[PDB]
Write a protein that binds this ligand. Structure first.
Ligand code: 9K1
Ligand code: ZN
Ligand code: ZN
Length: 386
């Protein structure tokens, strides 16, 4: 991005040059956090209402407080001849940079609110231009500066990557790779928050469209796939034209009515299994591509028909992915009973002790002992009722 680019401006040169670059951009970034606080946050408190400040700036002050201490510890480690303790700074501050979670989640809606407050008031609109002049001579608006903290967290792993490449001492190279991994994890934490928020928006849209559904879709996990299909059942053997929404825990069978969809059948995937039918084959005919969805006690069996082989293939992989998410490998290992969970507060995995990243269905919780864990960590968790 152009705004970040403009704001941030021998074999062992490269190694030493990278250290200067890291320290320079960190000072430049901490001053930018200071600029938002002094030139925008304190003067706008006299204009905007307290709730508007809370929404637009979020925890910006706490970010500045964390980076003030980070730049101080960075300077001491880089200062000492050798800079061998630099890796320890990045490892310690990865856990301190958790404060970014709240920021990353709320920043898009803070930008939207800032636009609304400025559009409604020429008074605020003129004060926003005034602040930009006193801080950066109008080169950067508050709108662009509030997006800078997010651009910055995604740069740390690109900075340490270059430093690792140009480090020749095998022990310092190995220690810096631990700091590089920890920074690569921080960049993944951002993606999980953006990705989960987009899922939460998609769910909201589906609630609007689906009629006669008297339940929140958030209870069924993540949307998998949605689309037209033909359906058959044991008691009604003729193909019914339908629209289906597949989420991790449920399949909704609806009837399309322009934009609106009327719920006809609710299928709870905890009790159902997928069975392939290769009979409709070699893409012979439209609507001949079928698989079965059978209830685990033989109570019901649905035949699902799709227009093409490509479509049927895609739906089958998504049903497999959904049932694997309800019932993952080692879900009942060591006395536990791990089930899909959406965590409100910041939580760590009982097995690897790492964060359950994101804002929606981040992992699993055993209902018995209440231990939290990642999908791939279930078998490693301590036995239920230690
Ligand atoms: C740079 C960066 C660092 C960390 C994050 C980040 C990613 N996921 C979380 C998290 N998740 C919890 C569930 O454990 C729910 C939750 C989510 C968001 C806010 N508050 C609570 N807690 C703290 C931070 N988190 C994102 C970006
Ligand atoms: Zn884990
Ligand atoms: Zn348990």
């Amino acid at each position: 991005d152009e705004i970040y680019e403009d704001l941030m401006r021998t074999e062992y040169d490269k190694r030493c040059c990278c250290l200067r670059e890291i320290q320079q951009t960190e000072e430049k970034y901490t001053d930018t956090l200071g600029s938002i606080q002094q030139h925008f946050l304190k003067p706008l408190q006299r204009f905007l209402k307290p709730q508007d400040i809370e929404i637009i700036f979020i925890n910006i002050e706490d970010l500045l407080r964390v980076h003030t201490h980070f730049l101080k510890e960075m300077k001491e480690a880089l200062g000492t001849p050798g800079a061998a303790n630099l890796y320890q700074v990045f490892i310690k501050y990865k856990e301190r940079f958790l404060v970014y979670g709240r920021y990353c989640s709320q920043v898009e809606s803070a930008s939207k609110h800032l636009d609304r407050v400025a559009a409604a008031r020429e008074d605020v609109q003129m004060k926003l231009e005034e602040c930009s002049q006193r801080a950066n001579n109008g080169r950067f608006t508050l709108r662009d500066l509030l997006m800078v903290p997010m651009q910055r967290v995604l740069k740390y792993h690109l900075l340490l990557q270059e430093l690792v490449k140009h480090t020749q001492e095998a022990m310092e190279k190995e220690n810096l790779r631990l700091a590089l991994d920890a920074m690569r994890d921080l960049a993944q934490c951002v993606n999980e928050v953006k990705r989960d928020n987009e899922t939460l928006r998609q769910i909201t849209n589906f609630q609007l469209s689906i009629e006669n559904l008297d339940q929140s879709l958030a209870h069924y996990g993540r949307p998998k796939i949605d689309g037209e299909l033909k359906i058959t059942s044991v008691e009604r053997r003729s193909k019914m034209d339908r629209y289906a929404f597949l989420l991790d825990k449920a399949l909704l069978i609806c009837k399309r009515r322009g934009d609106s969809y009327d719920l006809k059948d609710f299928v709870n995937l905890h009790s159902f299994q997928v069975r392939d039918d290769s009979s409709g084959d070699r893409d012979n005919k439209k609507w001949s591509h079928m698989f079965l969805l059978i209830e685990d006690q033989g109570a019901q069996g649905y035949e699902l028909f799709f227009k093409t082989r490509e479509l049927k293939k895609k739906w089958m992989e998504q049903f497999e992915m959904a049932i694997s998410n309800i019932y993952p490998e080692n879900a009942t290992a060591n006395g536990h009973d791990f089930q899909m969970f959406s965590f409100e507060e910041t939580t760590s995995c009982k097995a690897c002790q790492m964060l359950l990243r994101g804002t929606f269905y981040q992992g699993y919780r055993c209902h018995r002992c209440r231990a939290s864990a990642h999908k791939e960590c279930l078998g490693r968790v301590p036995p239920c009722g230690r």
